[PDB]
A paper describes a structure:
Human ZUFSP is a modular protein comprising 578 amino acids (aa) with four C2H2 type zinc fingers at the N terminus followed by a conserved motif interacting with Ub (MIU) juxtaposed to the catalytic domain (residues 294–578) at the C terminus. In summary, the UBDs in ZUFSP we have here identified, the ZHA and UBZ, form the distal and the putative proximal Ub binding sites, respectively, to together enable the DUB to selectively cleave K63-linked polyUb.
ZUFSPMIU-Cat was complexed with Ub-Prg and crystals of the complex were obtained at 14 mg/mL. The catalytic domain of ZUFSP consists of three subdomains: a compact central subdomain that is flanked by two helical extensions perpendicular to each other. The second extension created by α1 forms a long helical arm, ZUFSP helical arm (ZHA) that protrudes away from the central domain. The crystal structure reveals that the catalytic triad in ZUFSP is made up of C360, H491, and D512. A conserved Gln Q487 forms the oxyanion hole that stabilizes the carbonyl oxygen atom of the scissile bond. Strikingly, the conserved ZHA that extends out from the catalytic domain cradles the distal Ub by making extensive hydrophobic contacts with the Ile44 patch of Ub. Extensive hydrogen bonding and ionic interactions between R72 and R74 of Ub and D406, Q408, Q412, and E428 stabilize the C terminus of Ub. Intriguingly, only part of the MIU is ordered, and this does not mediate any interactions with Ub.
Numbering used by the authors:
A (entry chain A): 236 to 578
B (entry chain C): 1 to 75
């Protein structure tokens, strides 16, 4: 009797615990894109079917878009429908010609913005950031040999390319964290995946891990100072606006990533990062294209230390090209995967 | 008491813990069995990411509870 009383309560507790665990696991696997419920192709189609069902899109047009999607996916090429070009050149014009609170501003080289489409909304950030970074490398002659013949890949192709890096032997522990597969999924990725992808293409790059806050009020001054150092040059005759040859910086925090395309040193000596978000729709990006930039729009691009209070950031920065021997050295190093840590 | 720690690929381990264990201590115990540094771990239970300086006590973790383990920094 006594034993039965204990056994029954335990059973009931266990069952409730199990139900809770199962429900949570499901929610998390789904959020992280690891529940094996399908990929980009599926989401695009499902979301376009909503657009038909809601009466917002003709059924014929669904067939045309689907056709075009399938061609792009077969080729492995992004279709460009979420791309906005000319932001660097527009910022250069603005900073040169407009009365600002800026002493000096450093910009990365030409960079195309990519936002998520219907296919990757909610999960494509890391991939879209990779596309922005790559757009800059593809216009930079330093990377012509390593990246020869490449166009911006579509998200499914990026997933394939990561898998290829895993197959070569990069970062097996990272592969195992994502079930060794990315195609046909909505998997969140991080700087570690972007790293092995670029390394596998013979691009020299590295991660820096800002693993805890370094300033008052949970700020990350070290991060701002690292980016200033990356963008800036020692001195001499540097102009107020410097459009550098440097690629932009991939910026990860838990849950989301963005692309840093420059940094402003205000007249009061504080620093402000210029950040593109792959969540920003084309109509918002277009505002930066008009000759006089709204105050809200500029404010949206500008991030001060108060705006970066996540516990941990990682950056990935690109530094040049690798020899095959240097790539193989990095492939072996990636077996015990580490990054520079600050502090 | 025993608890379980499960990654989002379904890999599961058991840990021996006390209610007074900090989340920091639990991440150490995971490192002890899997070699994963604590800075790479995020633990979630009942919808909440668990904070380092709090105890299992603080979160009503019971024997045979499962914590979910998110690895590295992704988004
Ligand atoms: N979209
Ligand atoms: N995104």
């Amino acid at each position: 009797l006594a034993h039965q009383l204990q056994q029954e309560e335990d059973r009931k507790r266990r069952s409730e615990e199990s139900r809770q665990e199962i429900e949570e696991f499901q929610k998390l696997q789904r959020q992280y894109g690891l529940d094996n419920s399908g990929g980009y192709k599926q989401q695009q189609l499902r979301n376009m079917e909503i657009e038909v069902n809601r009466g917002r899109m003709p059924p014929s047009e669904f067939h045309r878009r689907k056709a075009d999607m399938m061609e792009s996916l077969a080729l492995g090429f992004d279709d460009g429908k979420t791309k906005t070009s000319g932001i660097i050149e527009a910022l250069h014009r603005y900073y040169q010609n407009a009365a600002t609170d800026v002493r000096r501003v450093w910009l990365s080289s030409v960079v195309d913005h990519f936002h998520s489409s219907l296919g990757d909304k909610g999960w494509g950030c890391g991939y879209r950031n990779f596309q922005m970074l790559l757009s800059s490398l593809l216009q930079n002659d330093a990377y012509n040999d390593c990246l020869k013949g490449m166009l911006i890949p579509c998200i499914p192709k990026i997933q394939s390319m990561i898998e290829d890096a895993w197959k070569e032997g990069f970062d097996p522990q990272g592969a195992s964290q994502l079930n060794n597969r990315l195609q046909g999924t909505k998997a969140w990725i991080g700087a570690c995946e972007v790293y092995i992808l670029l390394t596998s293409l013979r691009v020299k790059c590295h991660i820096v891990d800002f693993h805890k806050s370094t300033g008052p009020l949970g700020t990350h001054p070290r991060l701002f100072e690292w980016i200033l150092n990356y963008y800036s040059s020692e001195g001499e005759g540097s102009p107020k606006v410097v459009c550098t040859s440097k690629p932009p910086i991939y910026l990860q925090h838990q849950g989301h990533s963005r692309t840093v395309i420059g940094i402003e040193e205000k007249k009061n000596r504080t620093l402000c990062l210029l950040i593109l978000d792959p969540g920003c729709p084309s109509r918002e990006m277009q505002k930066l294209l008009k000759q006089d930039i709204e105050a809200s729009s500029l404010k949206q691009l500008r991030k001060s230390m108060g705006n970066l209070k996540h516990k941990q950031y990682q950056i990935l920065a690109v530094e040049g090209a690798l020899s095959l021997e240097e790539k193989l050295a990095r492939r072996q190093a990636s077996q015990v995967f580490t990054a520079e840590k600050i502090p | 008491m025993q608890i379980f720690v499960k990654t989002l690929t379904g890999k599961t381990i058991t840990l021996e813990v006390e209610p007074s264990d900090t989340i920091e201590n639990v991440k150490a115990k995971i490192q002890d069995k899997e070699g994963i540094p604590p800075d790479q771990q995020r633990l979630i239970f009942a919808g909440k990411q668990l904070e380092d300086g709090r105890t299992l006590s603080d979160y009503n973790i019971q024997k045979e509870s499962t914590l979910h383990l998110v690895l590295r920094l992704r988004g």
